[PDB]
């Protein structure tokens, strides 16, 4: 990881390390911190799968201690493990039992591909996309003990950017 | 489906006829009264797909005028369009938008794998495998207008043995 | 394949029954006309796959003889066989080997899936996916003796409403 | 299956209506005499998975009383319930817990794909393809109460040939 | 890194193990290499078998042989080859082969991973079909691979893979 | 990669770390000298899939300063990151927008299977399977920006070990 940047030109693009492949297996796994492994944090206790590939930013830290979160919203998955460049359009503001909970979510740069050239914030997305990702991050944890999330709202790409901006510096 | 029997013994077992295949795509198929093809009735609005094989078991036709669903809670996906032979062993029963719902659930018999031999009864499952199952029909709906359901309690054996049997009388 | 309709108000929609899903294992199925049996009409002889789920209309006629056939731009595979309603948005003109070669390029309805409703003709597709989709055509029988293709280009939903519209009343 | 062909010019080819796919899922599928449903026949008792895609030939009629069965041996998975064209190329002799047992081998004609044209009889296959379809149906039923089987040895296409021959004059 | 993983939390009740092949799937034999920490293909299956569980090793063991502590994780879905799961083991089985002795921890993911097998705490708790079918995979899949053979023992319980794996441990410092 | 050979007995065998999976999603990993992650380099713009396993031999140079590239013609999908020993048995030979552009094409060794026995030299490969690769590394680029490709030729196995044994030494 330490050689891996955090983008070209951050907060407008991100490396994302991907965590979750979309769809499939229920499978969570969390890359390990001291070690670089991708370890299965737990398998889902709902029948649910990621609405898209997951991940996360390196050299990003939030005000809770963790790296900047990304959901990436293209169709194929992704080998977890992998590093996608990807733009940041928006963000999915939660509040859980840990606290606040802030997703950014991410489309791949035109470089990777032509398919997203007209998706330039997540309002673009379409409303059946959002509300999936809304119901997901909601219900995913219904059946773990003590777990919940409230969906508080969506934000702007000019937002996520700011989130981006301020992890890289609470990072240094 | 006119040559394919309710099952050898009804209803003790019973040949269902599997139409949305557990995991994999989020495609509910539904096989058509007059063709007999599948047709796709929906994709799920939910980010969820089905915790087992589903499918309906011919010449049955429950009080509100379709045959009876079953939800086999086998681990492996089936090719929808196929005939699967099933013990049920319990029934999960709910209320929606349409009113009173009963699912069936089941597993394959001893003839098919031997995998199952000691579930005799829907309590013999797993209890996250029995909450899992409640938590899918009561939320994957959630994201289309209008829909909603609600669990009222699952029942025994017997309970969906009667079932089964009032859904066959009421076909002839 | 009698007792399945044309479309719910054709040709604003029309039901497509299956034959080759998008992408996975490059096997082209036909289904018979007299058996009504999906064969294998050949594996794909380039290493290509289908950008789309490709089918066909029933009883529908071009003026060469065969039925309507139409591309899904979905992004899932769909069981060959099954059959999907689906909005016309446009069709693509080509040239063939064996002539005049027209191909419905169509999307599925609402009822079936939020996540296109903002997509009303082929044109609002992304420019990727068409050219892509001309690209395909173009080039899948390159290695195949004596078979080759050209695109003429593409025409709007209005013209694919009219050849679908003539090819009902051609098979009356 | 009344409208399928038993081939073009059998014995040269014949027409397969595929039961099992090679790989993927140990679920062995068989079409019901009087129902043309594929049903669910069992799950592997093994850990095994069919080394070919697996079927048999309609309006053929070998000694036992079911239709001629093929092993197609090539390498990409067909949808259970197609069609396909080959061409016999020998036959496995085989003795199992109910008398004698004799599969074609068969591979897909050069219209189907070009990838096996110089393969005219089972010899040509790799050795340790041969192998391998030996120990397969030596094993699969190792772990099923009362079932075995003993291979006997490989016959050439001309008794493959002639097997299917008999077994469509007794048919008539 | 493997030298920054552990063997696990409360060895030997749980272990980590890192996955080398996926239950089912393509019979892809892959192994991690001791140098360079790479999944390298060790080869295709000679059979036409598939793994019945996901196959792995416990990092920081060593087995009289001198290879780590294997462990075959009896979850019916497939796991990433190079990812690293926490599991209990809850036995072994004990067959000798071309290479000696050669003895397999059976293992189930622990319940922070899913409450699907909470009550499978030994061996003996899973389906008979499904240890069968375990033994019938390590006495065949070799079939056609030239001079190598296995024949199995037996079973033996939760208590003797716990002690298995505290002597590979010690054995490993 | 430091600790990752060349081969056993190179040029005769190579190791190969793979970057892309036969088939399967059309997803272009690439690994990255600095880091050693695979990152997605773009997704495929044309709908095409590779036709083979595809990698790169560690330790090597081209005169472009890149690795010796290896397309693997085996059946099977590797995972990307894995490092698999192959036999070199020809080399595809192109002009592309980068200059000169040598395509190593190899299989698995007689070790890791006994299915190419008898395959020694790219001649001995199915001719559509040549075809097939040329067509891909030829077309698979048309929908790139700037890109182009033009293929020379195929040389024999001779040459292959010629080309890599010169990359190894550029190496040093």
Same mark, same amino acid.
């Given at each position: 990881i330490k050689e891996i940047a955090v983008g070209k030109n951050p907060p407008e693009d991100v490396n994302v390390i991907v965590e979750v !492949? #979309?769809?499939?297996? =229920?499978?969570?796994? $969390?890359?390990?911190?001291? !070690?670089? %492994?991708?370890?299965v944090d737990r398998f889902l206790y709902t029948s649910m799968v990621y609405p898209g590939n997951y991940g996360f930013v390196p050299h990003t830290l939030s005000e809770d201690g963790d790296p900047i979160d990304v959901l990436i919203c293209n169709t194929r998955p992704l080998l977890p493990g992998c590093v996608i460049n990807v733009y940041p359009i928006g963000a999915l503001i939660m509040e859980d039992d840990g606290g606040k909970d802030e997703?950014?979510? %991410?489309? =791949?740069? =035109?470089? #990777?591909?032509?398919?997203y050239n007209n998706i330039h914030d997540y309002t673009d997305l379409p409303?059946?996309?959002?509300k999936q990702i809304e119901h997901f991050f909601e219900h995913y944890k219904d059946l773990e003990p003590g777990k919940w999330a409230k969906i508080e709202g969506w934000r702007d790409? !000019?937002? %996520?950017? $700011? #989130?981006?901006?301020? %992890?890289? $510096?609470?990072?240094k």
């Open positions: !492949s #979309l769809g499939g297996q =229920p499978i969570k796994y $969390e890359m390990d911190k001291k !070690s670089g %492994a991708l370890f997703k950014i979510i %991410a489309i =791949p740069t =035109p470089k #990777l591909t032509q398919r409303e059946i996309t959002l790409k !000019s937002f %996520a950017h $700011e #989130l981006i901006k301020q %992890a890289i $510096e609470r990072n």
